[PDB]
Amino acid sequence: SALGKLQDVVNQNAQALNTLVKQLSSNFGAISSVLNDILARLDPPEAEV
């Protein structure tokens, strides 16, 4: 634990990036979290929503 101060910075940056990528897998109330699935499954009037 001598070099904890640098390790905290590295861990915080990696954790923030990891959480940012994990947020892509959430649908946020939509039918799916994948854009390609929405483009392939729906017409533009519902796809815009």
Place this chain on the structure above:
Amino acid sequence: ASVYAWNRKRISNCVADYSVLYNSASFSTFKCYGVSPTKLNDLCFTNVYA
């Protein structure tokens, strides 16, 4: 079958041409909710139930 005893048929291990369903005018209502009617020929599915 009647609505209280509605018949459920499993559809699996087949290639489906949905274009004959869209282009047929015999159906008074042809309304899809979670998928587009014209994209049905381009996707693969499982757990199809009628």
